[PDB]
Write a protein that binds this ligand. Structure first.
Ligand SMILES: *[C@@H]1O[C@H](CO)[C@@H](O[C@@H]2O[C@H](CO)[C@@H](O[C@@H]3O[C@H](CO[C@H]4O[C@H](CO[C@H]5O[C@H](CO)[C@@H](O)[C@H](O)[C@@H]5O[C@H]5O[C@H](CO)[C@@H](O)[C@H](O)[C@@H]5O)[C@@H](O)[C@H](O[C@H]5O[C@H](CO)[C@@H](O)[C@H](O)[C@@H]5O)[C@@H]4O)[C@@H](O)[C@H](O[C@H]4O[C@H](CO)[C@@H](O)[C@H](O)[C@@H]4O[C@H]4O[C@H](CO)[C@@H](O)[C@H](O)[C@@H]4O[C@H]4O[C@H](CO)[C@@H](O)[C@H](O)[C@@H]4O)[C@@H]3O)[C@H](O)[C@H]2NC(C)=O)[C@H](O)[C@H]1NC(C)=O
Ligand SMILES: *[C@@H]1O[C@H](CO)[C@@H](O[C@@H]2O[C@H](CO)[C@@H](O[C@@H]3O[C@H](CO[C@H]4O[C@H](CO[C@H]5O[C@H](CO)[C@@H](O)[C@H](O)[C@@H]5O[C@H]5O[C@H](CO)[C@@H](O)[C@H](O)[C@@H]5O)[C@@H](O)[C@H](O[C@H]5O[C@H](CO)[C@@H](O)[C@H](O)[C@@H]5O)[C@@H]4O)[C@@H](O)[C@H](O[C@H]4O[C@H](CO)[C@@H](O)[C@H](O)[C@@H]4O[C@H]4O[C@H](CO)[C@@H](O)[C@H](O)[C@@H]4O[C@H]4O[C@H](CO)[C@@H](O)[C@H](O)[C@@H]4O)[C@@H]3O)[C@H](O)[C@H]2NC(C)=O)[C@H](O)[C@H]1NC(C)=O
Ligand SMILES: *[C@@H]1O[C@H](CO)[C@@H](O[C@@H]2O[C@H](CO)[C@@H](O[C@@H]3O[C@H](CO[C@H]4O[C@H](CO[C@H]5O[C@H](CO)[C@@H](O)[C@H](O)[C@@H]5O[C@H]5O[C@H](CO)[C@@H](O)[C@H](O)[C@@H]5O)[C@@H](O)[C@H](O[C@H]5O[C@H](CO)[C@@H](O)[C@H](O)[C@@H]5O)[C@@H]4O)[C@@H](O)[C@H](O[C@H]4O[C@H](CO)[C@@H](O)[C@H](O)[C@@H]4O[C@H]4O[C@H](CO)[C@@H](O)[C@H](O)[C@@H]4O[C@H]4O[C@H](CO)[C@@H](O)[C@H](O)[C@@H]4O)[C@@H]3O)[C@H](O)[C@H]2NC(C)=O)[C@H](O)[C@H]1NC(C)=O
Ligand SMILES: *[C@@H]1O[C@H](CO)[C@@H](O[C@@H]2O[C@H](CO)[C@@H](O[C@@H]3O[C@H](CO[C@H]4O[C@H](CO[C@H]5O[C@H](CO)[C@@H](O)[C@H](O)[C@@H]5O[C@H]5O[C@H](CO)[C@@H](O)[C@H](O)[C@@H]5O)[C@@H](O)[C@H](O[C@H]5O[C@H](CO)[C@@H](O)[C@H](O)[C@@H]5O)[C@@H]4O)[C@@H](O)[C@H](O[C@H]4O[C@H](CO)[C@@H](O)[C@H](O)[C@@H]4O[C@H]4O[C@H](CO)[C@@H](O)[C@H](O)[C@@H]4O[C@H]4O[C@H](CO)[C@@H](O)[C@H](O)[C@@H]4O)[C@@H]3O)[C@H](O)[C@H]2NC(C)=O)[C@H](O)[C@H]1NC(C)=O
Ligand SMILES: CC(=O)N[C@H]1[C@H]([C@H](O)[C@H](O)CO)O[C@@](O)(C(=O)O)C[C@@H]1O
Ligand SMILES: [Ca+2]
Ligand SMILES: [Ca+2]
Ligand SMILES: [Ca+2]
Ligand SMILES: [Ca+2]
Ligand SMILES: [Ca+2]
Lengths: 388, 388, 388, 388
């Protein structure tokens, strides 16, 4: 095997087709399904799999009480077969911790998990299923990373980390790994003022990451990385189609180089594909909560501070719960272009459904089509009443 | 690996032997077995597996209530090892949707799943476990396909789809796929007046499909496809041994080029092997409901409008529930001829057993023998009372 | 791979060591373990596995009621990893039916399952996981076979079948298979008067089978097969150490060429290793029921009508339930000799423990040592009270 | 594959990072997790796995009552994927018995299990998943071995066994195996007065084992083995940082050549890495019970009778239960040095938590880092009240 190179451009996105769906909460009402959150999808050269952070309990288990909490000693990054649920019996643990990323470089997979108390966390970087490198907290305040896949080019796999405040300036670093070893790291540069939970994809030897400005911005920060020079830039999506949550209503003109205000100290992980007129943004439908999910075609969103939608697709109705969302692609597929894909975490339980004592999720995932396909909506599908 | 070619004729069918049986409803009374319907069997060069459409819940799970319904966002095509049950832990998802087909071409497998609302459905064609092509609804009325395996010849895998009314003329198309890409499609031609749910097999570079005329016919339509020319014909089975369900009693003379009347707007998926004097038809025993199942040797059924049985074999007694049935063969077996096989879906629960709130099935499957073997009957075997 | 040849003699048996044990009934009190009976062990070149006839239900499932019965449409030959229990999720179905044998020839595995009603049963012979040959009942009275592994030599795998009465003369046939095809069959010859359930092993190009004379004999019939000439002989074990069950007390002098009387129309599957002074016989301890199990070293048991034990080993105390027992060896092990092995079926439930409504078993298995090892006893270990 | 040689030295240990954690008791509150004890970790060239002695029941099963007991016919050495729990469906049985060790030699794995009554136990040595050698009890008093991995060098895998009293002199033997065959054995020599449960690692063609002196010592005996000469030495860790449990308080000066007194007839399995200034000792925090766990950097502990800690890391708080601990390394990792690893058994249930009737454990495991990483504590995490 050779290292994968990002040689292709994105396919033209004219609609989105169903790729995967695990129905995990429905199925786990009466089977041994682990409680999860922060899911994602990532491909190897011969298989694509679902990933998430386990909570170290089943959803029917008594230890599901308290799983609203984000960080414990009982979390782990797990992966499992595409569209199956994350079960006790089919989930493979990648590493232990409560914040993660993972990617395949064409030869083997790198997985990173962060664990520890808030003031003393550490990342362990695994390569070929073995621990290789460790990184201690630099700011002593919840070292944390993408919660979706990284992207590699000729063996170099950049990863975005943040350590520091969620409600003011923090210390974001871009690490450049190869075979699980640190080649270089850089502090964040550019005009993004706060970065968390980057969702990345690669095309034509460039990696684009759409992130969460938790502190101030309802527009999303974007980091663009050259994995050969090992350098990057940052800005915000210019468009007035605002894509964080909660957020204010959409204005007429956005902000390219600073956070669009109205909502402070909160957000959600999300994504975009930024490719000129072939630009699609994901967002929750609700401006107030993680409710609904839609894709909007917003030509030149990155650069055009007045850009509005020209097409769209509903993914989850606004009468259903959504959650985090992120990007991935099958960099080992056949053909001339990389097909954009994404997932949406469908959060069930706390805090919005507080008649149960747990929080979990299922996954839905879609990829682009060059056809203009009909749309369905894809809810989680479980009935909370059954769990009482 | 090279593409498989249909070089062999059918073996002489002198009786049927047990091939597989999963006992899924019995076992799922106390284990984590998914609710299914629309099962089938399909072989790869190194393994044969059971396939079906999951309902995204276990049979003991509370989400089994409502599973009489055919189309939801919680269905998927799954496969699992021959004669095991479809469990949460052993079922591999092929694709997401509520109508399917799948076949191996000798190199890898193509799987197709249709999803969407009734007026906006779409097919996704997967090849080598990746999405390759998408097809939007052409008639905006439940785009739908075979619900059993397709057949390939030198890489060309024809598939029959219908979109449109179930109770009047519809728009049937034969697509010719290779490596998941569309080579060609044609509209239905010939004298079949309505087509659904084709059950296909191949021999000597020809593919024969026995289908369901839901609208008018109690005889079954037959499509015969040349996968080299990429052309086809259609007619009905001429015999007065009528094989849809519900149906009128058997007459003395059938119809070759139009639907045999008496029953409108209903049917069941079924199959035949049409090979001159080596012709065998499957049918339910009951003329009123999906009850019992038998094979009848009906020499020249396709062409002889007075042909009656010369031999038979009971598969399921008329005091047991049956369901869909379909054809498959192991095109990678040893020997000089292809051995005909079939399966029967053994439907349990609603609507016939309405003391439970679910609908599911098990599978029995048989293949031909050149011996004249003794016969048993093969019921599902579960007791509904245990589920109350 | 080449076909395995029986080139080695037996290792010297000076005691027996623990090989495998599945604890299936203990574990299945609270996990999804299939109800079984008629287990055995058989090796492939790279793995050894447990085999048995499933009853198509879990032991906690409501469908376990009635599993005392031997023949239903819900039985199948399953295999699973050595010392694991037969679970819904790890059991591989080999074929469907209610009497079986299986063996590897060095290239691939042959498995045979018989199904049908008592007057119309048929065997299907699978090779390389595909059906190849079928055999109809010849006497219309419960066609039946070994219930433990067959043995192959240069691709020729003999199998012993019986069809006919269990309580008078029957029609026993030795079939010689190669690649699942019938080379030849012969009727039983020699002085054995009734044959069932042969337990076989091979050494130095000869196959020895120790069987059950259900009709009259409390000594066991022995068939010795030359798999090159495809011929056989039969007699009884001469020794007065009687090894069927139920049986009369041991006499002073046995019978070499006729059944030792005292018990009619019953028996149990059992085994021996018949190798001159290196001869070991298995038996239940009780003369009345399937209770206890012991190995006895009985020099020249086959030929010496006064031979008595010179050494022994208790396997199951007479205060614990036993069951069928049979022979197998790992013909692909390293070294200069074949190590004798056996298993004992530990039957729990009906008819001896009738406070439960099921019948099932676990497995213990041992192989020979050239050391004189200390002995333990190996009960099933489950508590029936837990199942009430 | 070639046999692995111990060519590397230990990496510099500046802290410990999380490697694996199975959360088995939390998860097994509502899934089919086997009851275990005496766990460990061991690597093959392509995978690392968790190992333990099953009790042949699930933790929710009724047969979990009585699992405080150490030796039964229902125990087996099982292995399962790293950080998954030991489930009925994913656990591979290595061999049957109630004391074990296992190691890979670079070509394949040797596993040893001891079974029998206390006065008549025997070891079976498996190689390449087949039984090869057997060893009878030499002292007729609970033949027993390491309960963690062995270590091999050029195919020679030494193993430490003890037979005899737990409360006076016993008969310890070092066996040197190759391909499961005995090359040599030696009686214990040196100044260790009692040996049990050795925890071993290899570096630079030497194997170091840290053991348990059950009879008298609260310092730990150390055996150092030359696997080429097949010879060994023994002494005690000289340091006054005492590492058995229970134990007296730490003195100022330890004992190098005799047991440090204060506690008789008890102990716990533990470990150390003894490498000059790169020396780290594990111990329980409590001096009275298996409570808490810490690593202490104790330069020259082996040789310096006044050596005190210079650094440490808490692994399990003293308000959480611990248990056995042992060493392992991935001898097939990339890089220039072997990274020290260890596990801690987190015992739950009896005797310390006697509101339940079972005893089981989970696993946490860590490996060394050359960074100075922040520390977390890693409890089992289950709530006993949930099991009542
Ligand atoms: C079967 O399946 C089919 C496939 O899925 C399905 O078809 C699909 O239907 C859906 C639903 O209708 C379509 O999705 C929608 O797409 C809209 C875009 O398309 C419309 O607009 C474009 C653009 O039009 C402007 O520009 C062009 C040129 O650039 C001009 O030609 C126009 O005249 C117009 O110009 C004006 O506007 C510009 C600025 O925007 C100015 O520059 C200009 O000067 C003028 O002012 C048209 O080109 C489209 O026409 C074409 O397509 C239609 C078919 O859809 C044909 O009939 C037609 O002939 C053409 O071919 C079309 O008119 C999206 O706008 C829309 O998304 C908004 O609405 C949804 C709710 O429905 C919101 O959830 C979403 O967030 C978007 O609205 C919010 O955000 C905007 C942006 O800020 C706000 O303005 C708005 O108020 C709203 O904000 C509020 O909500 C937010 C969210 O909660 C909140 O955050 C805010 O704060 C605020 O509260 C939606 O995506 C989809 O594209 C169809 N797909 C296809 C392929 O057809 C079909 O229906 C199915 N069949 C059945 C039977 O079910
Ligand atoms: C152990 O296992 C064994 C192996 O399984 C098992 O043996 C098997 O037994 C079963 C059961 O008996 C057999 O299965 C049946 O087979 C019948 C066919 O065989 C009979 O008929 C043929 C043909 O005979 C005609 O033709 C030949 C030449 O072509 C002539 O020689 C004849 O004289 C006769 O000619 C007349 O008819 C023609 C028109 O049909 C005219 O052309 C002609 O001019 C004359 O009028 C014979 O050859 C057979 O004989 C041979 O075999 C028997 C053994 O079976 C030997 O004894 C004998 O010596 C020969 O060797 C034989 O006589 C099928 O017809 C039958 O299926 C019908 O019945 C079942 C119910 O039992 C129905 O469910 C089924 O649907 C069929 O009936 C329906 O449909 C027909 C067609 O339209 C209707 O006419 C009929 O009324 C009925 O309709 C009703 O029900 C329908 C369904 O609900 C409904 O839809 C309708 O609307 C309506 O309500 C059945 O399959 C099997 O073949 C045996 N197998 C073998 C290998 O032997 C054995 O028993 C087991 N042992 C034990 C102990 O259990
Ligand atoms: C730790 O683990 C150790 C390893 O497991 C363990 O040691 C093992 O102990 C067990 C239990 O003791 C041993 O197993 C028993 O072995 C007996 C055989 O060994 C004895 O006999 C031989 C043979 O002796 C004759 O022959 C030699 C020469 O051939 C002569 O030298 C003798 O003098 C004698 O000659 C007479 O008999 C001949 C006819 O039989 C005539 O030819 C002759 O002219 C004379 O009349 C001896 O060689 C043995 O000695 C050697 O070994 C002992 C150690 O055991 C040493 O002390 C000694 O120094 C020697 O080295 C030894 O004496 C088996 O007979 C025995 O099995 C019977 O009993 C059990 C019950 O215990 C029954 O269940 C079983 O079925 C057998 O009895 C039934 O069947 C016989 C046969 O028909 C009947 O005769 C009998 O009445 C009985 O029938 C009844 O029950 C049946 C079953 O229910 C029923 O069907 C009938 O109808 C009827 O009701 C048993 O297997 C084992 O071998 C030891 N292993 C080793 C390696 O030592 C050790 O104890 C453990 N430690 C601890 C602390 O626990
Ligand atoms: C984020 O994560 C960080 C990384 O984990 C974390 O930092 C870590 O913090 C922990 C906790 O503080 C550290 O772990 C402790 O480490 C101690 C060792 O370090 C101290 O000591 C050394 C050595 O000092 C002597 O020697 C040097 C030279 O050799 C001299 O320079 C010194 O002056 C001194 O000399 C005296 O002593 C010698 C004899 O011992 C004589 O030779 C000499 O003549 C003098 O008398 C120092 O070098 C260290 O300083 C350096 O590090 C600190 C940071 O820790 C810096 O601030 C500093 O500037 C330096 O760089 C440091 O002072 C361990 O001793 C300690 O373990 C004991 O305590 C714990 C309880 O806390 C016990 O559980 C444990 O068992 C040990 O105590 C028991 O055992 C000893 C030995 O017998 C007994 O003496 C003692 O009484 C006690 O016994 C009792 O309990 C036993 C257990 O129950 C029982 O069995 C007994 O019977 C009895 O009842 C502990 O491991 C860790 O190393 C830090 N890691 C790092 C990298 O910094 C950080 O806090 C986290 N952040 C936050 C915000 O949470
Ligand atoms: C497991 C068990 O209880 N076995 C006992 C059996 C059975 O109770 C009956 O044989 C059942 O009918 O009875 C014995 O007398 C016997 O046969 O030797 C004693 C033996 O201990
Ligand atoms: Ca369960
Ligand atoms: Ca924000
Ligand atoms: Ca019809
Ligand atoms: Ca008998
Ligand atoms: Ca001690």
């Amino acid at each position: 095997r050779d290292f994968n190179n990002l040689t292709k451009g994105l396919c033209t996105i004219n609609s989105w087709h169903i790729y995967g769906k695990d129905n995990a909460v429905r199925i786990g009402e009466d089977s041994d399904v682990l409680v999860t959150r922060e899911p994602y999808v990532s491909c190897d050269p011969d298989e694509c799999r679902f990933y998430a952070l386990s909570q170290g309990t089943t959803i029917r288990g008594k230890h599901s009480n308290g799983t609203i909490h984000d960080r414990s000693q009982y979390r782990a990054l797990i992966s499992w077969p595409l569209s199956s649920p994350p079960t006790v019996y089919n989930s493979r643990v990648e590493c232990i911790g409560w914040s993660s990323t993972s990617c395949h470089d064409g030869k083997t997979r790198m997985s990173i998990c962060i664990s520890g108390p808030n003031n003393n966390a550490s990342a362990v970087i695994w390569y070929n299923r073995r621990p290789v490198t460790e990184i201690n907290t630099w700011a002593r305040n919840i070292l944390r990373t993408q919660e979706s896949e990284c992207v590699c080019h000729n063996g170099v796999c950049p990863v975005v980390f943040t350590d520091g405040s969620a409600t003011g300036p923090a210390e974001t670093r871009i690490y450049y790994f190869k075979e699980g070893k640190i080649l270089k790291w850089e502090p964040l540069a550019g005009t993004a003022k706060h970065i968390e939970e980057c969702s990345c994809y690669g095309e034509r030897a460039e990696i684009t990451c759409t992130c969460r400005d938790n502190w101030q911005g309802s527009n999303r920060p974007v980091i663009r990385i050259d994995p050969v020079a090992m350098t990057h830039t940052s800005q915000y999506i210019c468009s007035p189609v605002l894509t964080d949550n909660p957020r204010p209503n959409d204005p007429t003109v956005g902000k390219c180089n600073d956070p669009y205000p109205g909502n402070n100290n909160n957000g959600v992980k999300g994504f975009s594909y930024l490719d000129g007129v072939n630009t699609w943004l994901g967002r929750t439908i609700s401006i107030a909560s993680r409710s609904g999910y839609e894709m909007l075609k917003v030509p030149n969103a990155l650069t055009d501070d007045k850009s509005k939608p020209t097409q769209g697709q509903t993914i989850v109705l606004n009468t259903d719960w959504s959650g985090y969302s992120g990007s991935f692609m099958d960099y080992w597929a056949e053909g001339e272009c990389y097909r954009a894909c994404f997932y949406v975490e469908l959060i069930r339980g706390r805090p919005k459904e507080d008649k149960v004592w747990w929080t979990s999720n299922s996954i839905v995932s879609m990829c682009s089509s060059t056809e203009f396909l009909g749309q369905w909506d894809w809810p989680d599908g479980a009935k909370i009443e059954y769990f009482l």
